[PDB]
Ligand binder design. Structure first.
Ligand code: QUI
Ligand code: QUI
Ligand code: CL
Ligand code: MG
Lengths: 8, 10
DNA sequence: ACGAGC
DNA sequence: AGCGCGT
């Protein structure tokens, strides 16, 4: 859930 | 949600 | 370097 | 109760 690189 | 931003639900 | 969403 | 990742 975090979008630091995927934001899923 | 999603699993995925499961379902809603399951 | 990071946890979101009925 | 129920789970996914890439720059
Ligand atoms: C969002 O909180 C989140 C948490 N853990 C994960 C593990 C693997 C892929 C995606 C994920 N997303
Ligand atoms: C994005 O592609 C990505 C990949 N690896 C990570 C590791 C730790 C924190 C954030 C990250 N983001
Ligand atoms: Cl599933
Ligand atoms: Mg499953």
């Amino acid at each position: 859930x975090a979008x630091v690189x995927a934001x899923v | 949600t999603x699993p995925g931003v499961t379902x809603p639900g399951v």
